[PDB]
Structures are given as C-alpha cells and as structure tokens.
C-alpha cells in the first residue's frame, strides 16, 4: 500500500523534501502529522484549495492533519488588528470544514494558543540568534506583504513559522512552493534548537485566471463566495490558449480541483464539435486539448459547471 | 533641594537631555518619578559603566527611584554567549554595581528574563516589530550590535525589546549613553503609539579611553573595577593627558565624571601648595593656565580613584 499511498501524496506536488524521506517516514512510525498554516484571510480562493486538497490526500493516506490559523502571523504581515484577524480566523475554520476538511479528519490550531507560551517564545530567541538577518529576509521574498523596506516583524514571521512545525508536532510540512525558502531554514535550524528536520512537500503556486501572477488587486482569481453568475464570468474570460497546456488556468483547475475530487469529468458537447466526452485522468484531457480534440470553449463550460458544483456544495455544508 | 538644584545635579555633565522642558515637569509633577540605565551583563565592569552608575547616583539624590536593569536576554540577543554564561556574569555584574554603591538600600535590580518572556511584554514585542520598519531598527544598533553588517534576526528584535523596557518598568527618565539615543527616539516616538508614555532621556557622554582612543578590550585602554592599585597608577601615569587641553582629555575626564561628583571636591598635592578643587571649572581653568601639572593631577586622580575601588572591591569581598 506504501506505493499507493506514495503515488496519492504525491500527487500535483512540485517538490518533495526528500522523497526518500517521505518513504522511510510512511514506514517507521504508523502516526505522520501533516500540517498547512494560512494567515486567516477574508477571501478564501482556488489557492487555498490546493493545499487543502493535498491535506484531504494526506488524510486519505493515513495521516493526522492539522490546519494552523496563523492568526499571530497574519499580524505579523499587516493583515489587520488582532481584533479583525480572529474573526476571520472563525470564519475560514468553518471554510475549510465546508471544504472537505471536517473536524473529524482534521484538527484546527489558533496560533495565539501556543506561540505566546514561554517555551515557544524562548525558541524564537534562540531561532533569531542563530539566524542572519539577510536570511530571514531572503526567506520572505515572495511572502511578505512588503518586499522593500519591510517591518521587523516579517523578519520574526519565518522564525516562527518553522517552530510552529516543531510546536505542532508535525512530521511534514505542507505547503505552497514559495513557502520553500521558509521550509529549508526549518530543515537548517530546527535540529540545532533539539528538534527534527520536517519532510516538505510543496505544491505548485497557480497562477491568475489571466495567465499572470494571482493577486488581490486585479482579482484574477475564483472566491469560495463568488456566485455560480460570477464563476461563469470569470471563467469564460479566462486566458486559456488552445493546445498549451502549462500555465493555463482553466487546465489547472481541471487538474488541481475537479479531477482530484470527482475522478473524472465530462464535457458536454454539440454533436458538431464532437458530441460528449468524458476523461477519466487529466493526461487523457491535456492530451485532447494538446492534440485540438477538445477546444477552450467547451473545456470552460465544464470547468465552470463542475467549480460551481463544488462551490454550491461548500456553501450548502457551510449553511 | 529644591527644583533648581535637582536639575543642576541630574543635568551634570549629561551631553543631552530630551529635553529638559520635559524633565522639570516630570520633577515637579511626579513624586518619585523614576529612571533606570540597563546593562548586558559584562565580564569587566569599567569607568565607562561607573559613568552611568555616578549618574544613577545623582538621580537618586534628586528624588528619583532608581533601577537597575541586568538585561541578560538583550546580551543573549547580542551574541555575548549562552544563557549559563550570561547568568553567571549578570549575579557577578549585580554584585559589582552594588559594590559601587548602588546598593539594594538605594536602587532596585531587575533581571529582564524576570518579565521579557511574560505574556504582554511578548505580545507588546510583536505589537513593536509591526510599527518599526527594519531599516530603522538596524539603524538603532549601528553603535550597539556586536554585528554591524550581516546582523543576527536577534540584533533587530533587541532594540525594540529595549523601547518595550521603559513602559514595562515603569520608566519615566530613561538613562543611557549617547550611542543609545537611535534606540530612546524610537521609543520616545512608538512607545505613544503603543498606548505608552514617551520616556525624557538622558544621554551621558561617551568617555575615551585612556589613550584618548575608543575604548577596547584588545587595547586595554581603560580602568577595570578590578585593577589592582599599582596597575591603576600605571595605566593613569601612562595615560593620555595633553598639557593646557581639557577636551577629552581622560584624566581630567576621571576628575570631571567620577571624582568630583563623588567626593565633592578633590585634593591635588603640590610642592611649596596643595589646592582643593571644588569645582570642575576651577579644575579645568588652572590646567589650561598651567597652574596645575599633568603629573600632579595624574598623582590625585590615582589616588581618589583607588580609594574608589579599594573600597568597592572590600565591599565586593
Ligand atoms: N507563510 C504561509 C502561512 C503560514 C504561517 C505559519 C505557518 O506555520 C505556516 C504557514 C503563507 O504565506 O501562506
Ligand atoms: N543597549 C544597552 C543595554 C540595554 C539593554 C536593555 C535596556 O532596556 C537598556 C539598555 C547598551 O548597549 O549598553
């Protein structure tokens, strides 16, 4: 079974630290921990799903997992007031129960529980005299909330990230790839405060729905509260060139989301375009797309069909 | 006394005060304002430390509570070893300053890992860290850090510990080198914006070593509370002492900053025609004019200050 349920972790994943880690890991010890952490966030999107997703994968495979609502970091990186930040923390625990990940698979953590506990916040010394300033700002390029001239408080952020994989017991850490830097300096620096070097496994950062970097300003992106109307807008204008199969928004959700959830997917179709087809794996669909079999057009109707299935269920559980 | 010779004293030969609109009102207002100097831990106290201690001194003359901060986390931060060290010297450090005559009868010791893991100074850290960019906080320890490029995290975090101690402790007059006022104006300015009250300031000068140089441990250029008395008198009879120049001048500046303060006068013996000083001014006017000898000043400095640490070190024990 250590094959299957290798085969599942690892699937969509970009980079596993190390593979032969993860192996001897599923081996010795019939207990892994998992983890994700997410600065509570107002708009819960398509990125967030990713993570999630590989956390259900994870739990599938037989692991304890854990969603760390970062609240303290997310104050860290100017997200808000403590105040306005625990509320958002509520809200996406209950997202993120709507998701998939029920209180029953999954154990939800505030930050704040723990990371002002004596223990934890001497590590953090201890973290911060052993680690260089141009690391720790290294560490947050692609993280921060201010790449020039940021607050001493992003420089504390990634030293509190990697003791939260040492404080929440965890065994693998799970993650974006550009959580990557953050997750060597934990691999670097954990074991000289007496704990493990944690597993990574890092998933791919998706890009916008115009084929660009996500961001919150254009809001080239799909919310868990954007209305059926919404997605279809959103997803008919999407970049999505024909036969490119890299970068493309529309195949990404096809191969990160539905196929992941629903095991294949079917494309309706007029009978002049080639009637109804279904595919049962994602190299099946990119293979049509590449080829031309299966056109843009008709892929975004059933992408959008298929995401507002999902989204509608989430917000159905969500009550 | 009354507030005119409070300032006088407080002020003495202080480089800066910010400001001092601020302190007569903290004076005249607050019954026992107090005010505080932290110190990391250090194996060798020197006159550079007895600088703000003679300060502390005068502060308390005035009304004032004093307090002592052996600030063993902040000297961790700044790579002066592991915990068990630090520990060590910080109990050494406490029985030194006592010894000096900031005796548990007249100032307070605080240890900072007594409050600085607690849980609202740690949440008031993170508060701090939110409001302070990185470029100012490396800015404030440019004359403090142990690192001046390729600082440690720690070494960023320092600073805003330091602003955090003066609301923590209840500081109203925070007292300090020249080289700590980047640290007390980013508390004067972000304290405030924490809820907390913007601290006065007190600046001491930065006192040479006895080289007339930047005091170092490589040099040895300095008086240690531990030199014996015939190596005191030969580190001030080997000392930089420019005839006819007062400015800087490090005997003079012993006369000026430890001596006179302490012992209200000082005695300087000359062939016939011994002269008692009892002003700083007086002191300094007659070595510009040549009246008074490098050589004799040297032979009176060295003498007040041996019984200084002659009788610190048989309190010590
Ligand atoms: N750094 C993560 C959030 C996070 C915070 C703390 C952690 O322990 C883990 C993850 C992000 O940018 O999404
Ligand atoms: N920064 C001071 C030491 C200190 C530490 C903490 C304080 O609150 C005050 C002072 C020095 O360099 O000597």
Redesign the pocket.
């Given at each position: 079974d250590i094959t299957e349920k290798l085969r599942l972790i690892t699937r969509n994943a970009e980079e596993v630290v190390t593979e032969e880690e993860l192996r001897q890991l599923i081996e010795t010890k019939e207990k892994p921990r998992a983890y994700?952490?997410?600065?509570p966030s107002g708009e819960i999107h398509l990125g967030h799903m990713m993570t999630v997703q590989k956390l259900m994968d994870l739990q599938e495979a037989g692991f304890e997992i854990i969603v760390?609502l970062?609240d303290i970091?997310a104050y860290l990186n100017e997200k808000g007031t403590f105040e306005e930040i625990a509320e958002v923390a509520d809200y996406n625990k209950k997202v993120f129960i709507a998701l998939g990940l029920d209180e029953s698979r999954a154990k939800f953590v505030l930050?704040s529980e723990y990371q002002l506990s004596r223990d934890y916040v001497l590590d953090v010394l201890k973290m911060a005299r052993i680690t260089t300033l141009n690391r720790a700002r290294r560490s947050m390029d692609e993280?921060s909330r201010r790449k020039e001239d940021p607050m001493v408080s992003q420089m504390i952020y990634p030293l509190?990230?990697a003791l939260?994989?040492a404080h929440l017991g965890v065994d693998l850490a799970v993650?974006?790839i550009?959580?990557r830097k953050?997750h060597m300096l934990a691999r670097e620096n954990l074991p000289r405060l007496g704990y493990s070097s944690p597993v990574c496994l890092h998933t791919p950062i998706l890009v916008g729905l115009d084929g660009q970097k996500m961001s919150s300003s254009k809001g080239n992106y799909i919310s868990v509260r954007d209305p059926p109307e919404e997605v279809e807008r959103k997803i008919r204008k999407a970049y999505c060139p024909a036969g490119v199969v890299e970068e493309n928004p529309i195949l990404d959700i096809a191969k990160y989301h539905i196929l992941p959830r629903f095991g294949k997917i079917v494309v309706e179709r007029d009978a002049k375009f080639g009637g109804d087809v279904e595919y049962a794996s994602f190299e099946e669909l990119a293979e049509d797309f590449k080829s031309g079999q299966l056109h843009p057009l008709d892929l975004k109707i059933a992408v959008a069909k298929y995401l507002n299935m999902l989204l509608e269920d989430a917000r159905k559980r969500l009550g």
């Open positions: 994700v952490g997410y600065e760390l970062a970091h930050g993280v509190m990230q939260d994989i993650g974006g550009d959580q953050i």
